[PDB]
Design a protein around this nucleic acid. Sequence first.
DNA 1: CGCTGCGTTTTTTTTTTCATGTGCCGGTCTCACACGTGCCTGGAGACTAGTAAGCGCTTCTAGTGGCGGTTAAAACGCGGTAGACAGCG
Length: 75
Amino acid sequence: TDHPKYSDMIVAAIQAEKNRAGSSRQSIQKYIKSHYKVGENADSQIKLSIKRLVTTGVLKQTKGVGASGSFRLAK
DNA sequence: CGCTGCGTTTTTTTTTTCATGTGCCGGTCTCACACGTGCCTGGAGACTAGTAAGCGCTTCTAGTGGCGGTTAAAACGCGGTAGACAGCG
Ligand SMILES: [K+]
């Protein structure tokens, strides 16, 4: 029972939810609690992690700024 | 393997029909406005009379300046933070 790396947890959930707009923080957060396991902050962690993927170019942004909008996978 | 574009399949947006409720015209029937008539009460006349109120005069209050002094209170401005407003699901 463990929370693998920010990205190694989102990678797993965004991966099972095909969408033309993609997957958006609300959706993602609802997955992790569903099947995996966590205490809390997670949601605040998920945001910074997704911000790390925005800047670098790991996970694209569909529409919106910060942790508001839709965030897909690499290619 | 990775990309890249380019025909495909779908989505978005445009244009044209289309089925809907609108308010628009012109003929029938109803009971409500308007008239009227006749009776009765409440307004008018007029004069009486008694008292309220308005004007001037008496006083004296309580309202309007005005004079500085000290302080508490406004002013102003700078600095940052949390709350207003938009945007996403
Ligand atoms: K007075």
